[PDB]
């Protein structure tokens, strides 16, 4: 690791600077370096890690979708043969995306999840594990696709079980986990009814717990509740 000689605190400081500069690849590299120092991550640090890689992989996913769409059109009846280039370049972006996902999954497995004992850390990391297997599933087409899907499902399910036992229904990590697991059901697992049920139950149970919250906590929880509602509106 090229960050091995940099202080942990300096890596975290530079991750925050990279964020302000919208340099998310740098941000991710700094936070990978910080994780590899071997200490547990604080709440702020976990979110720096997640923001960085979410932005990096999000851009890869958007590019992959553009190229996949072009590739699918090149294969319709009537298209002129353009050669191997569209497939090659889609494969290039795909392989880079898989590499980023494997990197994040590797950090979670060595050794963030096994040292995470508090609900807020363990659920956070298991959600990430589900998310990055979900991104692998989005591009998967081979002998391993079912197993990738089941790896996402299993991580999301463990996170869900912990979150229902240990966090209130308005907890933003619990809400975001449910939002994403619901999308997993709809888009990956071919289970739209499960997706809709999960989003609705999550929304309704959160609604009933809003009365316990401060104004600032209310703002955070209702933001994600609105995303649940947005998806329900898309799907119904």
């Amino acid at each position: 690791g090229a960050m091995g000689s940099m202080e942990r605190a300096s890596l975290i400081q530079k991750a925050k600077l990279a964020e302000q500069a919208e340099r998310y690849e740098d941000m991710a590299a700094f936070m990978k370096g910080a994780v590899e120092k071997g200490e547990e991550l604080s709440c702020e640090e976990r979110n720096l890690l997640s923001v960085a890689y979410k932005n990096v992989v999000g851009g890869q996913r958007a590019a992959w979708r553009v190229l996949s769409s072009i590739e699918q059109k090149s294969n319709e009846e009537g298209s002129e043969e353009k050669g191997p280039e569209v497939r090659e370049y889609r494969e290039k972006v795909e392989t880079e995306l898989q590499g980023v996902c494997d990197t994040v999954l590797g950090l979670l497995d060595s050794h963030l999840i096994k040292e995470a004992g508090d609900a807020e850390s363990r659920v956070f990391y298991l959600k990430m594990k589900g998310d990055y297997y979900r991104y692998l599933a989005e591009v998967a087409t081979g002998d391993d696709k079912k197993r990738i899907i089941d790896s996402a499902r299993s991580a999301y399910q463990e996170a869900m079980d912990i979150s229902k036992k240990e966090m209130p229904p308005t907890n933003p990590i619990r809400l975001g986990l449910a939002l994403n697991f619901s999308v997993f059901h709809y888009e990956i697992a071919n289970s739209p009814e499960e997706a809709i049920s999960l989003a609705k139950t999550t929304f309704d149970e959160a609604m009933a717990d809003l009365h316990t919250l401060s104004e600032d906590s209310y703002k955070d929880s209702t933001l994600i509740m609105q995303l649940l509602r947005d998806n329900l509106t898309l799907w119904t």
């Binding site: 998310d131 975001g176 939002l179 994403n180 999308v183 709809y186 947005d230 998806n231 799907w235």
Partner: peptide
């Protein structure tokens, strides 16, 4: 696409 966070 649907919303995730």
């Amino acid at each position: 696409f649907p919303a995730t966070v």
